[PDB]
Ligand binder design. Structure first.
Ligand SMILES: *O[C@H]1[C@@H](O)[C@H](n2cnc3c(N)ncnc32)O[C@@H]1COP(=O)(O)OP(=O)(O)OP(=O)(O)OC[C@H]1O[C@@H](n2c[n+](C)c3c(=O)[nH]c(N)nc32)[C@H](O)[C@@H]1O
Ligand SMILES: [Mg+2]
Ligand SMILES: [Mg+2]
Ligand SMILES: [Mg+2]
Lengths: 729, 728, 483
RNA sequence: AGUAGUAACAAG
RNA sequence: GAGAAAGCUAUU
RNA sequence: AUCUAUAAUAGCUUUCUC
């Protein structure tokens, strides 16, 4: 309507004020004058709406032919203002007018609504074609992670998505053709051919496309299912004390399945390596493990990939291992070489020191990136060699940078100059290697300049390549262009036919992560695969449920009440270095409680799960002494021997046991004489309370000053705040 | 008889687990009535009371009486103290810089680059802003436009460049102008027989002198805060004009860049991210407690946070933080605390004097406060006016050099608090403190060998904060063993508990329209399920309560109900006519089919398959007149007929606005024509330093050329179009 | 620099830590025990435990409010036809004759055959609503010249002592009744097992809540505020009669309409959100105001007749009161149903905790018990100075009544008291957990708390209840000083 | 009157 | 007459 | 490994003097 617009402009330029506004206001100042409003927006719109819905004509009608089809009156109900305010005033109507339109109004085509709101219809399809499992009541430990809100077709950064939308819907008024936007060119074309004759208003289409192309990531509490298909049902997924099994519809990406498979395999390994015959337990748990909806074995077979734990589970289940790794855009498959990851402090080019886990030893990997292939030999903190096959240039340099940051060498570390942070805004750790990989994808120029060069080799079919993306006389150090049954033992170690061990259970990562897909362990002992807080709560609840028989067995027997399945699950969250020492300490404390008949139910309950691992005494036979017993993961996961703890606290006034925030009444299964029973009898191994505070001895002795005391020696031990007590060996 | 005691619940349940019962948010929030001048004068008096031991002088720029508490005598009691020591502030900032190398430089660089890429229209992103041209309050875009028009009148054109830096340069150059010509508003008053008074506004050219303009540009307009929960007494808030908002943005951005990278800052994290950060910090403090020792947490708030913080200290902080920046950026970051150090407070609407015998009342404004003998005021107002008199300016405004009037430097104040938190120790004593700071609320974690050394550390922290002009409230703070505390209304008891009552006011009908309210209410229920401990039973009950309130608000009860109403007749007719009754929307008398699982699907999509074809066609009619259709050729609106708009025709009584409406309509027509020419202007903000007329003319010329070359227009109309384009 | 400055700062600048003990926790607001102060009067907008609903078995049709009131008054024709005033009590600055004339005008306007509930602008109606009571606004110059025009000293809410009627209301509103007033709409069908669990829990929770008097009171408030807002907007310059009505359901399922009284709306030209419209309320009751005169200083009570439920009749009184409301209060009264949510969420969470400890749903066990688990009990109150325990449902009703009272007696005094007393509650919890709390200025805490205790009945009663609970906590901690 | 509570409304 | 900042939600 | 990036409007919550 170019002619109509020119006529409109000529009509508008007939006033001195419109002419002044159009001539003086710049195009930037349009964003100012479009918001011009001499009146303040009414506050409290809920009150305003409740007030206006009781009025006669609260709604505004757009003047036109469709408004005229509404009668001024209908059965004695006035639907709109009379013909007095057709001009210069603005027509209004009642809500009965809207209801009349929905009842006796003209009927139009409901096409265009289906395309604009197609994302919501896909959401409804996923909900309807979904299966609901059973509901479980028990502790759920939720971590607050940044997760994707709704599933997306092609996740794009908002700037690139804005440019793509601008290309699709407003190609004439678009601007400079940014290079990145050409990457999605094909997609752009498709959308345009689908919107050639759409009469929907362009801005609604723009926000439809933005809803289809822009990710919305928010911090949310999650527990074990972080894929967007589960995030959209998060509210029905779980609470703090219940879980609901949900199987969403649609099709799931292979990345989610691989990540969930790795998480499940790691959890199974962690649970298994603590039991007698870990192979049998690992196989039993793996045979009843379901990833989303398929069994674990099928996912292991169908997916070529994984990590060390995945290969261990594959061997245990009788499948073939695939020593192939992933580095985001790099796929590495090991050939030969065993190494260990050790965490040391590493300097970076910015001068910052970061605690990084670097692998030691010499190893070789066949590496692939898109349509690029090569081999890579590396040593500890020193890159050895990278042979490259012929491939496309950008993929070539991407593979080069991915391999050179994979080597974990000093040149790469000191070639980092800029702004790199390994901490989340919420103070959560980001994996340093992945962050460096992400950084060097857009700023590899500094890396290549820092790397250096040398003279090219002069072999037959070998030539050197430079960052100048062309055949150059100079090549950088390390890059060379070339144009052409395992049996798993009882302790979950993979050995060849010869005797050499490829990978062991100690090689699995210690990281606790949330699976993208919901993992289900169809076994009555599912809770043994939970997190640390859930495991502690379930173990202590089991102890409370069987308290009477445990106490009877302990007061009659000596050793058989220390070996139980619940305690075997509990041992998997005790760090293995301290498990034996904790067991020795706790066994000594319980034995000294029994011997002198001083029995404290709260302390017996608290220290019973720790008496499961084989004891580890000191040279003299005396057990180690502790103030608190640390558990895996998080700084709040510990058990205080004397006082309360975030995981275990006891109130003798109410006789109430607080375990991980849940209150259990110990009343009834307790003698009130224990309120008048000294606590210090069950705080130290081989120590009994003698009396009150003695100024003769002086300061309260610490653990290291107390383990070295000879028998029969007095000492002052502070039980808790304001309770000075003297103790004797 | 047995008497119910509700507090006895706390015998069975710990307080944190039942903290929601201590938030009476089902009741009406307090509201203020009448003037806020009393609270404003109280604020001025209190602000000057904590600095009266400082240096008092007379400003040679405006003539106001200025008080400078910085580097004043150290306090000798526990009363609020505004005497921050410059050297101590510098030492805290230097310790912060040593603990986080390159933090200040990175923050300065980011702020400078953002300022370089910042446009003027950013200033339009505020609420009610003091307009100096009319000496009133106007929306931010209107105030900015009036400022730009006035600056154009005064031969200042920095806004035409489009960036924030030339606009700020023109602002500080306007401060040097000996005279200021602008557009103000005059109200013609008419004696309407009925008698009443009719007001008709019109714009006129006004002029002010240099000092008068400077005082107006430095003036803050004060009003009263409504609907605030938790406070017995009401309080006044303040708003600044364009001249100050232009410069506060950059300092805010710099301090935000600093705060993002501090492990002790509670800002700008919020919600679940803030909860995760605080939980990780608490866990870290628990792990790092020395063996055999004790740890204390102090739940603390700072009393008189805004009245004691001094903008001169902020000037020093900005000079220290931007140490390695170019000179121009350092000056730019120095402008804002300087303008705050000379700020002038507008006292408000005044006081109303009444004669009860004659039933008469009249409003005495702030300029006329001292035209009445002080014996004609209340006792409290008389005392306040007597204390106010030295700082009172004969224009009805007060000099308020000390203090920050209301929350303008939350980020920079947080930086100062975190710097206090970063000292960690005094004199190598046997304790170590850390903690979390968010604005003025704080949690202090002190690890030591026993309780006495912990209290020594808390005392040292209190005194160190005194050195920085920060006063910990001994009344509102307390200390206990670590593992249980409070921070910004979030209660930690071995993990943050859920406070459901806090979100209770959000569960009502929002009041946008019938379609939007349903989606908003269901989304609120879903999010409260996710992160407020709202169980499935409570969520289903919330669905029921929302549906009941929705039906009573929009008068859309069930079609088979016998409720009388103007809409209910047609709703019953639709119910009888419709065959697929389960597909009717709740706003049209249909049943509610929402439950827990489908809480995230919009209502129309959820009922689309159950909908009658005739009802579906009527509801989703692309040309229904209840939704505004964009036009210069009408487009298709895909949302249904329930997306209507209650066009807010604010007819404030006894005032007939005929000339403000004229200018607003002129702007609206120009912008609508611009959108017609540039269809993308509503999606992406257009850029360019040229006139809108030339941009539209070139776009129209290109469109005419292209649609003539494609055969969409004939020769004759193309000749007419090119003739009209050339006539421009 | 910091070390040097702290070396010279006066030692008087101190945080003065003091270790909190039970002996250091004193009762809040001692003046509420001072008998020289008046008992706090009843200031709620409508009657709560003294309400009397005239029941009329409805035929399932929502006919109309005026028609409903006409039918209810036709059923109780003796009360309707009483035309002489038998004054029982008179409000101090009130006109009994004008109030009775207004009541008769209401009855006649609601009993006639016309379809309009508008009243005429008679002298008694003008007095009751308050007509021409606004002060005339003059110009500033005239007022400045006039030495009689002075700033008015603000009224301060006076100090009152504990009144036993608040305890009696708490006891009565949390008691079970035989009528259901909640009108919860339909919900979508259940598919997921979590939805089935939610519905199973909702059965117990809303069955316990639906049969308490507090629920009927809440519905009365909600419906009346809806009607009042609608009438105020629709009839700005008219006096309208608005019946106070409810719809209840028996255990047999038969629906009744309850007429609790009538109301008159004055002129409602509410420009601002704090602008007041006067509502003159005439409520039926069977409580004799002469039993507790200190409760009813705001009410003019006539005895209008007698009613029969049993072999002994009960007097029917008409409590008449001039009252006021604004738009904010009406809007927040329309959404008082949310008093349910805060009540049941707090309780549902408790149930959920137990489930996590047991591995299965514990709603039936918590409410009624089962073979494995005994019913859950809570300390709910005192009888003869001794702790008394009630069921889970009783505690749920108590929490619901507490939220209802938060709405009914809500103002700035309640907000300030809630905040300050919450700080004190956190200190007391830290004391109970043996966290060894330390204070810096406890007298300041108590002064901040007591600043808000003036004349809100719920705040004064909450101070009394807090003192009683604190005494019980001290007595319970006296045994904890032995471990 | 009353609502209300440090100041207002009780129409302009 | 109803401000600043942060988080979240809805909408165009 | 979500780390980057992120138009405007409106609402809600929190904090910001007693
Ligand atoms: O999400 C986490 C993890 O589950 C996921 N991940 C890890 N491995 C895969 C595979 N193979 N496919 C899909 N997803 C995978 O990515 C995150 C990694 O966290 P985590 O496993 O805890 O990392 P870890 O501590 O185990 O190793 P890290 O050094 O951070 O690097 C992870 C990744 O890189 C491999 N890797 C790097 N280097 C330098 C290696 C080396 O020298 N030798 C070997 N054998 N591997 C090296 C790691 O092994 C992993 O493959
Ligand atoms: Mg404060
Ligand atoms: Mg605090
Ligand atoms: Mg605070």
């Amino acid at each position: 309507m170019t002619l109509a617009k020119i006529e409109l402009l000529k009509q508008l330029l007939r006033d001195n004020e419109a002419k002044t506004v159009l001539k003086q206001t710049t195009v930037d100042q349009y964003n100012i004058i479009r918001k011009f409003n001499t009146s303040r927006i009414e506050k409290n719109p809920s009150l305003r709406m409740k007030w206006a819905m009781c009025s006669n004509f609260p709604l505004a009608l757009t003047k036109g032919d469709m408004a005229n089809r509404i009668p001024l009156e209908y059965k004695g109900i006035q639907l709109k203002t009379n013909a007095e305010d057709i001009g210069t005033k603005g027509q209004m109507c009642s809500i009965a007018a809207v209801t009349w339109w929905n009842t006796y109004g003209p009927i139009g085509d409901t096409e265009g609504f289906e395309r604009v709101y197609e994302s919501f219809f896909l959401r409804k399809m996923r909900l309807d074609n979904a299966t609901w499992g059973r509901i479980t009541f028990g502790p759920v430990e939720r971590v607050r992670k940044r997760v994707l809100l709704n599933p997306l077709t092609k996740e794009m950064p908002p700037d690139e998505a804005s440019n793509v939308i601008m290309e699709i819907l407003f190609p004439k008024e678009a601007g400079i053709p940014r290079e990145s936007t050409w990457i999605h060119r094909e997609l752009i074309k498709e959308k345009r051919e689908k919107l050639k004759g759409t009469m929907i208003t362009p801005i609604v289409l723009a926000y439809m496309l933005e809803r289809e192309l822009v990710a919305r990531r928010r911090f949310l509490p999650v527990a074990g299912a972080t894929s967007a298909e589960f995030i959209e049902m998060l509210h029905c997924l779980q609470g703090e004390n219940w879980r609901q099994i949900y199987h969403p519809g649609g099709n799931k990406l292979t990345e989610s399945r691989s990540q969930s498979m790795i998480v499940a395999c790691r959890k199974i390994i962690r649970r298994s390596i603590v039991a007698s015959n870990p192979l049998e337990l690992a196989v039993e748990i793996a045979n009843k493990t379901v990833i989303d909806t398929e069994p674990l074995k099928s996912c292991l077979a169908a997916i070529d990939g994984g990590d060390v734990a995945c290969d261990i589970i594959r061997a245990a289940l009788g499948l073939k291992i695939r020593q192939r790794q992933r580095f985001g855009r790099l796929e590495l498959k090991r050939i030969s070489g065993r190494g260990f990851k050790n965490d040391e402090e590493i300097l970076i080019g910015n001068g910052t020191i970061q605690k990084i886990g670097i692998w030691d030893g010499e190893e070789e990997f066949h590496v692939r990136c898109g349509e690029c292939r090569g081999i890579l030999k590396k040593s500890k903190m020193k890159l050895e060699k990278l042979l490259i096959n012929s491939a496309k240039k950008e993929d070539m340099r991407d593979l080069i940078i991915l391999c050179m940051v994979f080597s974990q060498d000093t040149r790469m570390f000191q070639g980092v100059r800029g702004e790199i942070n390994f901490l989340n805004r919420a103070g959560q750790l980001l994996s340093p290697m992945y962050q460096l990989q992400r950084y060097f994808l857009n700023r590899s120029n500094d890396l290549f300049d820092q790397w250096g060069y040398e003279e090219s080799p002069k072999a037959s079919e070998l030539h050197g390549i430079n960052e100048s993306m062309n055949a150059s006389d100079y090549t950088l150090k390390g890059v060379v262009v070339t144009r052409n049954k395992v049996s798993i033992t009882k302790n979950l170690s993979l050995i060849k036919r010869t005797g050499e061990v490829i990978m062991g259970a100690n090689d699995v990562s210690e990281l606790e992560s949330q699976a993208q897909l919901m993992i289900t362990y169809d076994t009555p002992k599912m809770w043994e695969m939970g997190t640390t807080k859930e495991l502690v709560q379930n173990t202590y609840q089991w102890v409370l449920k069987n308290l009477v028989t445990l106490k009877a067995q302990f007061l009659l027997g000596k050793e058989d009440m220390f070996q139980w399945d619940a305690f075997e699950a509990f041992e998997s969250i005790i760090p293995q270095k301290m498990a034996g020492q904790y067991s020795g300490f706790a066994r000594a404390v319980l034995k000294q409680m029994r011997d002198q008949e001083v029995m404290k139910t709260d302390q017996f309950i608290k220290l019973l799960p720790f008496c499961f691992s084989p004891p580890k005494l000191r040279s003299n036979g005396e057990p180690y002494q502790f103030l608190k017993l640390v558990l895996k993961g998080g700084g709040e996961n510990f058990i205080e021997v004397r006082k309360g703890s975030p995981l275990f606290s006891y109130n003798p006034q109410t006789e109430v046991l607080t375990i991980c925030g849940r209150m259990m009444s110990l009343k009834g299964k307790i003698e009130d004489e224990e309120r008048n029973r000294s606590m210090g009898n069950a705080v130290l191994a081989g120590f009994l309370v003698s009396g009150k505070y003695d100024p003769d001895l002086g300061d309260f002795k610490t653990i290291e000053e107390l383990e070295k005391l000879k028998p029969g020696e007095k000492a002052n031990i502070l039980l808790y705040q304001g309770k000075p007590v003297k103790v004797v060996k | 008889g047995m008497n119910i005691n509700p507090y006895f619940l706390f015998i069975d349940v710990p307080i944190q687990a039942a903290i929601s019962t201590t938030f009476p948010y089902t009741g009406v929030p307090p509201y203020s009535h009448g003037t806020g001048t009393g609270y404003t004068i109280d604020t001025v008096i209190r602000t000057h009371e904590y600095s009266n031991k400082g240096k008092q002088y007379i400003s040679d720029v405006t003539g106001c009486t200025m008080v400078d508490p910085t580097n004043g005598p150290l306090p000798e009691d526990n009363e609020p103290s505004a005497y921050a020591q410059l050297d101590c502030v510098l030492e805290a900032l230097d310790r912060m810089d040593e603990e986080h190398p390159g933090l200040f430089q990175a923050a300065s660089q980011n702020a400078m680059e953002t300022l370089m890429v910042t446009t003027v229209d950013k200033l339009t992103q505020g609420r009610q802003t003091f307009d100096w041209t009319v000496c009133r309050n106007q929306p931010a875009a209107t105030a900015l436009n009036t400022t730009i028009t006035s600056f154009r009148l005064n031969d200042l054109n920095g806004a035409d460049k489009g960036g924030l830096i030339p606009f700020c340069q023109d602002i500080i150059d306007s401060l040097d102008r000996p005279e200021m010509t602008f557009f103000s508003v005059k109200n013609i008053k008419k004696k309407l027989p009925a008698f009443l008074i009719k007001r008709i506004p019109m714009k006129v050219k006004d002029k002010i002198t240099k000092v008068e303009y400077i005082k107006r540009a430095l003036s803050l307009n004060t009003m009263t805060k409504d609907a605030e929960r938790g406070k017995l007494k009401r309080r006044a808030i303040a708003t600044a004009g364009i001249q100050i908002r232009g410069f506060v943005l950059v300092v805010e951005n710099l301090a935000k860049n600093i705060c993002e990278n501090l492990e002790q800052s509670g800002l700008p994290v919020g919600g679940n991210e803030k909860k995760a950060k605080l939980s990780n910090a608490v866990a870290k403090m628990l792990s790092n407690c020395p063996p055999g020792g004790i740890s204390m947490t102090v739940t603390g708030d700072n009393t008189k946070w805004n009245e004691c913080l001094n903008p001169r200290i902020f000037l020093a902080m900005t000079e220290r933080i931007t140490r390695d920046s170019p000179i121009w950026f350092r000056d730019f970051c120095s402008i804002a605390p300087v303008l705050f150090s000379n700020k002038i407070a507008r006292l408000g609407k005044g006081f109303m004097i009444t004669s009860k015998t004659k039933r008469l009342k009249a409003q005495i404004p702030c300029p006329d406060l001292f035209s009445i003998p002080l014996e004609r005021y209340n006792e409290e107002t008389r005392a306040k006016l007597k204390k106010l008199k030295p700082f009172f300016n004969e224009e009805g405004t007060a000099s308020l050099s000390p203090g920050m009037m209301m929350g303008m430097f939350n980020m920079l104040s947080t930086v100062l608090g975190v710097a206090a938190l970063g000292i960690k120790n005094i004199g190598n004593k046997e304790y170590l403190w850390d903690g979390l700071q968010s604005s003025d609320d704080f949690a202090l974690f002190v690890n030591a060998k026993d309780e006495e050394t912990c209290m020594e550390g808390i005392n040292d922290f209190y005194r160190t904060c005194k050195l920085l002009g920060i006063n910990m409230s001994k009344k509102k703070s307390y200390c206990n063993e670590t593992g249980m505390f409070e921070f910004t209304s979030m209660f930690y008891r071995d993990g943050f508990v859920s406070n459901f009552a806090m979100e209770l006011p959000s569960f009502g009908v929002a009041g946008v329209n019938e379609s939007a309210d349903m989606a908003i209410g269901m989304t609120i229920i879903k999010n409260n399920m996710i992160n407020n401990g709202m169980g499935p039973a409570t969520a289903q009950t919330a669905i029921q309560l929302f549906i009941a309130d929705y039906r009573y608000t929009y008068k859309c009860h069930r079609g088979d109900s016998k409720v009388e109403g103007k809409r209910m007749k047609i709703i019953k007719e639709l119910w009888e006519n419709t065959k697929g009754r389960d597909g009717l929307l709740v706003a049209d008398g249909g049943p509610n089919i929402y439950n827990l699982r489908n809480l995230h699907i919009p209502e129309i999509v959820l009922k689309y398959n159950l909908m009658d074809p005739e009802y579906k066609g009527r509801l989703l009619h692309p040309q229904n007149p209840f939704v505004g259709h964009l036009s210069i050729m009408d487009y298709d609106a895909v949302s249904g007929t329930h997306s209507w708009r209650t066009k807010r025709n604010r007819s404030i009584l006894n005032t007939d606005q005929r000339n403000m409406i004229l200018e607003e309509q002129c702007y609206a027509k120009c912008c609508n024509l611009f959108e017609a020419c540039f269809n993308s202007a509503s999606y992406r903000k257009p850029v360019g330093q040229h006139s809108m007329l030339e941009a539209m003319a070139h776009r129209l010329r290109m469109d005419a050329r292209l649609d003539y070359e494609s055969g969409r227009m004939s020769k004759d109309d193309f000749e007419k179009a090119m003739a009209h384009l050339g006539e421009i | 620099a910091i070390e040097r400055n702290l070396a010279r700062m006066s030692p008087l600048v101190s945080v003065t830590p003091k270790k909190l003990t039970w002996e250091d926790l004193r009762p809040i607001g001692p003046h509420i025990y001072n008998h020289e102060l008046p008992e706090v009067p009843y200031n709620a907008f409508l009657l709560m435990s003294d309400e009397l609903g005239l029941a009329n078995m409805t035929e399932g049709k929502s006919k109309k409010p005026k028609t409903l009131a006409k039918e209810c008054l036709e059923k109780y024709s003796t009360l309707r036809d009483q035309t002489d005033p038998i004054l029982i009590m008179k409000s101090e600055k009130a006109n009994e004759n004008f109030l009775w004339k207004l009541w008769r005008d209401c009855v006649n306007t609601i009993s006639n055959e016309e379809m309009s509930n508008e009243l005429q602008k008679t002298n008694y109606a003008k007095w009751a609503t308050g007509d021409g009571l606004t002060y005339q606004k003059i110009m500033k110059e005239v007022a400045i010249d006039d030495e009689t025009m002075c700033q008015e000293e603000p009224k301060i809410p006076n100090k009152c002592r504990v009144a036993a009627w608040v305890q009696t209301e708490m006891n009565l509103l949390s008691t079970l009744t035989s009528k259901r007033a909640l009108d919860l709409p339909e919900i979508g069908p259940d598919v997921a097992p979590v939805e089935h669990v939610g519905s199973e829990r909702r059965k117990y929770f809303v069955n316990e809540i639906n049969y308490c008097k507090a629920s009927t009171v809440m519905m009365k408030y909600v419906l009346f505020h809806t009607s009042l807002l609608n009438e105020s907007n629709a009839s700005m310059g008219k006096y309208k009669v608005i019946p106070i009505t409810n719809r209840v359901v028996n255990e047999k399922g038969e629906s009744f309409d309850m007429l609790y009284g009538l109301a008159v709306k004055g002129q409602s030209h509410l420009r601002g959100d704090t602008d007041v419209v006067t509502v003159v309320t005439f409520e039926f009751s069977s409580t004799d105001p002469r039993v507790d005169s200190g409760k009813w200083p705001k009410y003019t009570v006539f005895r209008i007749g007698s009613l029969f439920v049993s072999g002994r009749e009960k007097s029917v009184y008409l409590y008449c009161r001039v009252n006021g409301t604004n738009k904010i209060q009406m809007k927040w009264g329309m959404e008082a149903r949310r008093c349910l949510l805060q009540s049941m969420q707090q309780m549902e969470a408790i149930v959920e905790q137990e489930s996590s400890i047991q591995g299965y749903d514990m709603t039936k066990a918590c409410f009624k018990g089962d073979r494995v688990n005994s019913p859950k009990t809570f300390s709910i109150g005192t009888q003869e100075g001794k702790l008394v325990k009630g069921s889970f449902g009783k505690a749920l009703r108590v929490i619901f009544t507490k939220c209802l009272m938060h709405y009914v007696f809500g103002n700035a005094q309640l907000e300030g008291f809630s905040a300050e007393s919450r700080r004190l509650l956190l200190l007391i919890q830290a004391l109970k957990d043996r966290k060894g709390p330390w204070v810096f200025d406890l007298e300041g805490m108590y002064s901040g708390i007591e600043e808000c205790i003036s004349n809100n009945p719920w705040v004064i009663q909450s101070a009394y209840w807090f003192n009683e609970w604190l005494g019980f906590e001290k007595e319970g901690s006296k045994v904890l000083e032995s471990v």
